[PDB]
Ligand binder design. Structure first.
Ligand SMILES: Nc1nc2c(ncn2[C@@H]2O[C@H](COP(=O)(O)OP(=O)(O)OP(=O)(O)O)[C@@H](O)[C@H]2O)c(=O)[nH]1
Ligand SMILES: Nc1ncnc2c1ncn2[C@@H]1O[C@H](COP(=O)(O)OP(=O)(O)CP(=O)(O)O)[C@@H](O)[C@H]1O
Ligand SMILES: Nc1nc2c(ncn2[C@@H]2O[C@H](COP(=O)(O)OP(=O)(O)O)[C@@H](O)[C@H]2O)c(=O)[nH]1
Ligand SMILES: [Ca+2]
Ligand SMILES: [Ca+2]
Ligand SMILES: [Ca+2]
Ligand SMILES: [Mg+2]
Ligand SMILES: [Mg+2]
Ligand SMILES: [Mg+2]
Lengths: 423, 337, 54, 438
């Protein structure tokens, strides 16, 4: 019994979090009312990692829904699986955060964070042995970004020996709501550098490019983007939700994937991405899984080097053929894997495939090419900050310019740390 | 697409082999410390054989046989011929040799002087040379070694002398042993000839090394280019002068010695049932006396080639030693055994 | 090729064939190291909580 | 009669232990409920199998075994397995959260909180023994518990049982089945601190077992069950002399006496033959000469290496089945005239031979075919140092960048223990070269 507590914060975090629970509930056979209606005991063997068992054989997600606006959480409560969440785990204010990291982190969010910690504490007290936490949020807004990182800091203070894991959506000018998103994201990245053990970098730029270029969606919506996040989140949590041997808990995953504490920002990938009944062979799954066009961080892996790689194949397939194709990609592109970490590519296989697919593959890379993401955010930050543009939104909440200067320096250090291991 | 690494930059043989592999477009070169290779062109000293054959999904091959140093060292060759029943002390094609340790350090001092007292010219040499002494007195030989392990063997006082010139020579043969322990003898050899007349009464006319004839010999390049005579001319000479062929008078004994030596150490160095495979190119040096008898001088484990034969031989290395294990998309004589 | 020390029983036998003749830290010290590592963990956690308190 | 206590640590140690005791019961005619009809001394006795099994007044034969794991899922398999009736709950010790492939977490952080409990449960088994020989410790090199907690347990056993012998069965890490990048760290850290506390250790490279399962059993992708059934056969061959009548390796002290002249060089190489697939309806039975010759093939060794480029310090042959001394000597004579078997000058060139007439027992429905005769060779070769060289090299690559080191320092381990452990391995690797190379 190695329980995980899930938290979703802000508009993006709750919309992506709700789809995640919708996806894995279907994979585990849980219906919108919390009743199990599956046909395999493999669905329930690790069900308690994400679900609590209540009276009447009901399964309740161990999920806490947080926002400074009621709007999106009303949509969740009215969505498909809205009734499955614990009603007391809805923690919301009324003011909103106006896409303002300072409001989420320092003013509006400080007023609400203690009531979130009460729900976290209540969920943790009913855990046989709590593994840690997973948080879904965006970095470009105010609540998920500012209040989410405030939550992570206060969760670390109360549970210092537990693993903190995040799915963090990076802003992009291609899929942008406001011009201050680079400010909010730069402020959040330093929080994540200090206070998370594992962060899946989900780049809205990559999600948009995949929907437009690959999936041939001329006008991608947020729902289209969230379909890619659902599939990715289900894939990267397969090892936690089903019986296996590799990266079966969050701490063993961090030990395998993080050779240096600050470089814990992962590039996720998924295969297939089809715009549909054709069976996909193991060589095709393996080639697509390593292709840059299947990456969710919009970073060219050939521009950097892989520190560690985790690969998860789902479905009934030849595991011998999987090992052959996995060893083929490494032996035919060994210049992109660091030679000072032997056997840094680990492969896991799960028999149960995602809904609507015979087989799939999920990629988790700790590549030094992720510095391209942080460089991109750093450049957009500096373009405005050199002229102090839009800072009044933040100084009006009590922040000083020096905190922006330090956030800027912090992320340029992070970029330089990736560069020293790429050489 | 096959992968290989290069760990001996000073190898003229395998620098050309590495150049040929890249020219095929189906072989990729990796960094020298990258373990995900199919082929290792390894270093001469302390090749880490213990780390080969442990990469899952990679058939690995190395261009050196582990343990072949027993054949390619002065004192090791003498001990191997004396103590192996396959070769025995009654070996007829190897000169009477003795392993002599310097007094500042088993040993065969009292055995060497026993046969010495019973033509009494010997030669002292070792593997630490470019340091060779040829004397008829045993006192100068034992005193020179005291001044590393050395060996003293009988100096062939009646060598076969080429005419015109009255000059000494030695025959170099290149032998390639593949991963199946097939013994391939390169059809092309070289005679490294002396350019000075042999004087049976100075070491320039007695040592036929290619470097000594180019530094201390004043007749370098006179009779043949670079003091190197190839088999076509040498065979024609044996027909015109001695009324015999190179195959009959010499090459039968050479093939016999190559087989005897390599079959002796086959149980100790074979990679037949091993987790990695080995091949190796050897350099056999032979002496011929006036009776047309062939004598083995030494075996080189990291030999160089003749400039005219680099292209042909290196392509043969790729053909039978490298492509036989890693096929892409005869100049040898197979000594069966 | 000599066989020596042949011992036979109902369930088997044993012998030796020769082919050729020849030619701690105390409990206290362990407890000290275990407690020294625990103290280093406590010091690192105190530094974290001090950092978070700032 | 002198008792032996088996201790299984971590997932590898427990799952291999489960496979071994399964084989022991089949070999001794013990049923899953603990009953042994052939045992006529009800409730007691000092027979050779009593070195591994105690007896209750109800006639149940209970393994002298302790299972320890910092996570309960693997030992819960034993609690609800086929042989659940053998063990009482005091023998199965589980924690809540594991060592996360972190030596320091298993050794320092979690080990400190559970070491006294484990020793207390071991003390309960030792109090049943009238003359305890010592301990057999099964564990992996690469796991956080198998590496970290075992080294702490071995230190405390030397304190609480100073006169007792301790033998290891150690699983050497192989990327084809391994689950952690830091396993070279854990292997070298645990070898350093265990070295002075182990009298004789049998290393088993998962790479060798994996390849033997693929090559000889035609298993395309072997599982842990396939690997552990083969490992338990080798372990059974090694411990059979403690559980059956005989005169060779009759107590744990004799293992060190016969296989370990130099105390630090206490890692004998094991080679086993024959391994025949059960899917073969009929297989030509190999002779004494053929299985004995197979003991000098690297493809049958528990650790892949080349004993031709090393020197022997000792050599035991453990036969099971239709074998008589006459055919052993005839096979050895032929092998000496064909193999490169170099002994060190300060040791006799010989073989201590043990023969048990009962042929190997196989798990019904398993992958191994029944054979009329089998042999396990235990030879102390310097060639096994190749496994140390590979391990130390992977250590050197990661540690030069201090990769993953923060995980160990964060558990209270000092960075100096890394280099201190590595220097010990360098000294160990140098000892092998002085003994085996001229
Ligand atoms: N032969 C064999 N090897 C195993 C088995 N189980 C795990 N291993 C190997 O052991 C190593 C990992 O160590 P584990 O025993 O699983 O870890 P642990 O001792 O439980 O310690 P933790 O980190 O706390 O889980 C890997 O190299 C595995 O290949 C097994 O059943 N048989
Ligand atoms: N017993 C002997 N009788 C006559 N000449 C001999 C001899 N031993 C050696 N030589 C001469 O010495 C020369 C070189 O000797 P040796 O082969 O030991 O040196 P070396 O090994 O440094 C040359 P290589 O580059 O082929 O290894 C040969 O050309 C040969 O003519
Ligand atoms: N992928 C994805 N991104 C979103 C979604 N909603 C908002 N975003 C992104 O998140 C940022 C806006 O933050 P948001 O979550 O709406 O603000 P918050 O409610 O204050 O946390 C912008 O970068 C948006 O592009 C969504 O549903 N899916
Ligand atoms: Ca207010
Ligand atoms: Ca009894
Ligand atoms: Ca001791
Ligand atoms: Mg919004
Ligand atoms: Mg030479
Ligand atoms: Mg475990």
């Amino acid at each position: 019994m190695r329980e995980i507590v899930h938290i979703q914060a802000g508009q993006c975090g709750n919309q992506i979090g709700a789809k995640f629970w919708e996806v894995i509930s279907d994979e585990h056979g849980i219906d919108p009312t919390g009743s199990y209606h599956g046909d395999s005991d493999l669905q329930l063997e690790r069900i308690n990692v994400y679900y609590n068992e209540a009276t009447g054989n009901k399964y309740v997600p161990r999920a806490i829904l947080v926002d400074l606006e009621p709007g999106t959480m009303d949509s969740v409560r009215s969505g498909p699986f809205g009734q499955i969440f614990r009603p007391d785990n809805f923690v919301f204010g009324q003011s909103g955060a106006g896409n303002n990291w300072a409001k989420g982190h320092y003013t509006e969010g400080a007023e609400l964070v203690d009531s979130v910690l009460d729900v976290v504490r209540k969920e943790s007290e009913s855990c046989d042995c709590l593994q840690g936490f997973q948080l879904t949020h965006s970095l470009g807004g105010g609540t998920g970004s500012g209040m989410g990182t405030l939550l992570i800091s206060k969760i670390r203070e109360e549970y210092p020996d537990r693993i903190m894991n995040t799915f963090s959506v990076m802003p992009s000018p291609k899929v942008s709501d406001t011009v201050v998103e680079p400010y909010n994201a730069t402020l959040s990245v330093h929080q994540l550098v200090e206070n998370t053990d594992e962060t899946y970098c989900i780049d809205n730029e990559a999600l948009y490019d995949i929907c437009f270029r690959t999936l041939k969606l001329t006008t991608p919506t947020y729902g289209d983007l969230n379909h890619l996040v659902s599939a990715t989140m289900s894939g990267v949590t397969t090892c936690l939700r089903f019986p296996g041997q590799l990266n079966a808990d969050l701490r063993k995953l961090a030990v395998n994937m993080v050779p240096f504490p600050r470089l814990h920002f992962f590039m996720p990938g998924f295969a297939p991405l089809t715009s549909q009944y054709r069976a996909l062979t193991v060589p095709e799954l393996t080639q697509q899984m390593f292709d840059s066009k299947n990456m969710m961080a919009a970073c060219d892996p050939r521009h950097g080097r892989y520190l560690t790689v985790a690969a998860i194949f789902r479905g009934r397939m030849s595991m011998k053929e999987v090992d052959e194709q996995m060893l083929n990609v490494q032996n035919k592109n060994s210049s992109y894997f660091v030679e000072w970490i032997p056997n840094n590519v680990k492969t896991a296989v799960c028999d149960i495939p995602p809904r609507g697919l015979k087989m799939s593959a999920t990629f988790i890379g700790n590549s030094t090419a992720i510095q391209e993401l942080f460089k991109r955010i750093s450049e957009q930050f500096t373009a405005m900050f050199r002229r102090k543009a839009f800072l009044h939104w933040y100084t009006g909440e009590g922040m000083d310019e020096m905190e922006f200067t330090e956030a800027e320096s912090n992320m340029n250090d992070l970029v330089s740390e990736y560069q020293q291991y790429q050489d | 697409m096959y992968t290989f690494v290069v760990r001996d930059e000073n190898s003229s043989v395998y620098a050309e082999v590495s150049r040929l592999l890249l020219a095929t477009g189906q072989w990729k070169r990796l960094r020298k410390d990258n373990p995900r290779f199919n082929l290792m062109l390894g270093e001469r000293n302390r090749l880490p054989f213990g780390r080969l054959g442990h990469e899952p999904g990679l058939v690995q091959l190395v261009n050196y046989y582990r343990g072949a140093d027993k054949l390619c060292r002065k004192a090791s060759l003498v001990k191997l011929i004396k103590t192996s029943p396959e070769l025995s002390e009654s070996c007829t094609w190897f000169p009477e040799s003795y392993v002599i340790y310097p007094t500042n350090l088993t040993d065969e001092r009292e055995v060497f002087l026993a046969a010495y007292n019973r033509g009494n010219v010997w030669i002292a040499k070792s593997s630490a040379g470019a340091g060779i002494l040829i004397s008829s007195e045993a006192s100068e030989l034992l005193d020179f070694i005291d001044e590393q392990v050395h060996v003293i063997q009988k100096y062939l006082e009646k060598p076969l002398l080429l005419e015109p010139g009255h000059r000494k020579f030695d025959i170099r043969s290149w032998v390639l042993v593949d991963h199946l322990y097939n013994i391939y003898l390169y059809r092309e050899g070289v005679l490294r000839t002396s350019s000075e007349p042999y004087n049976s009464a100075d070491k320039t006319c007695h040592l036929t090394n290619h470097c000594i004839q180019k530094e201390y010999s004043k007749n370098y390049g006179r009779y043949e280019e670079g003091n190197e005579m190839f088999f076509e001319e040498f065979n024609q000479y044996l027909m015109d002068a001695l009324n015999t062929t190179l195959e009959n008078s010499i090459l039968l004994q050479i093939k016999h010695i190559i087989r005897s030596c390599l079959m002796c150490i086959e149980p100790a160095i074979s990679t037949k049932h091993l987790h990695y495979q080995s091949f190796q190119l050897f350099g056999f040096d032979f002496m011929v006396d006036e009776e047309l008898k062939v004598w083995l001088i030494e075996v080189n484990g990291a030999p160089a080639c003749a400039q005219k034969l680099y292209a042909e031989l290196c392509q043969g290395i790729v053909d039978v030693a490298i492509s036989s294990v890693f096929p892409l998309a005869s100049i040898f004589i197979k000594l069966h055994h | 090729m000599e066989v020596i020390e042949l011992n036979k029983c109902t369930s088997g036998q044993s012998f030796e064939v020769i082919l050729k003749p020849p030619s701690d830290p105390s409990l206290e010290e362990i407890q000290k190291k275990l407690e020294a590592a625990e103290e280093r963990r406590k010091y690192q956690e105190a530094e974290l909580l001090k950092h978070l308190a700032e | 009669m002198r008792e032996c206590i088996s201790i299984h640590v971590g997932q590898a140690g427990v799952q291999i232990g489960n496979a071994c005791w399964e084989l022991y019961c089949l070999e001794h005619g013990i049923q899953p409920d603990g009953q042994m009809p052939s045992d006529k001394t009800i409730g007691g006795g000092d027979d050779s199998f009593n070195t591994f099994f105690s007896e209750t007044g109800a006639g149940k034969h209970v393994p002298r075994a302790v299972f320890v794991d910092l996570e309960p899922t693997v030992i819960d398999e034993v609690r609800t397995g086929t042989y659940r009736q053998l063990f009482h709950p005091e023998q199965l010790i589980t924690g809540k959260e594991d060592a996360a492939n972190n030596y320091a977490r298993g050794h320092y952080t979690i080990g400190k909180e559970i070491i006294d409990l484990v020793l207390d449960r071991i003390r309960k088994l030792a109090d049943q023994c009238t003359g305890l020989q010592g301990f057999l410790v099964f564990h992996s090199f690469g796991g956080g518990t198998g590496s970290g907690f075992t080294s702490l347990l071995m230190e405390r056993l030397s304190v609480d049982y100073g006169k007792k012998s301790k033998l290891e069965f150690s699983i050497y890490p192989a990327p084809q089945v391994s689950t952690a990048v830091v396993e070279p760290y854990n292997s070298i850290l645990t070898t350093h601190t265990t070295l002075e506390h182990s009298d004789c250790a049998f290393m088993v490279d998962n790479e060798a077992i994996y390849d033997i399962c693929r090559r000889n059993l035609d298993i395309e992708r072997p599982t842990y069950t396939n690997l552990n059934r083969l490992i338990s056969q080798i372990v059974s061959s090694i411990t059979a002399s403690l559980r059956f009548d005989g005169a060779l390796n009759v107590d744990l002290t004799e293992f060190q006496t016969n296989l370990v002249p130099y105390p630090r060089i206490h890692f004998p190489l094991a080679t086993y033959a024959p391994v025949i697939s059960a899917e073969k309806a009929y297989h030509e039975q190999l002779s004494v000469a053929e299985i004995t010759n197979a003991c000098f093939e690297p493809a049958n060794q528990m650790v892949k290496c080349d004993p031709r480029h090393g020197k022997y310090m000792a050599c035991c042959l453990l036969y099971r089945g239709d074998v008589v001394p006459k055919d052993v000597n005839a096979a050895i004579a032929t092998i000496k005239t064909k193999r490169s078997i170099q002994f060190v000058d300060w040791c006799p060139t010989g073989f201590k031979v043990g023969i048990n007439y009962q042929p190997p027992t196989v798990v019904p429905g398993g992958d191994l075919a029944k054979v009329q005769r089998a042999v396990c060779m235990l030879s102390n070769t310097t060639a096994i140092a190749e496994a140390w060289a590979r391990l130390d090299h992977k250590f050197d690559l990661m540690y030069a960048k201090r990769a993953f080191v923060h995980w160990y320092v964060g558990e209270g381990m000092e960075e100096g223990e890394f280099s201190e452990a590595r220097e010990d391995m360098a000294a160990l690797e140098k000892d092998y070269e002085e003994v085996g190379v001229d």
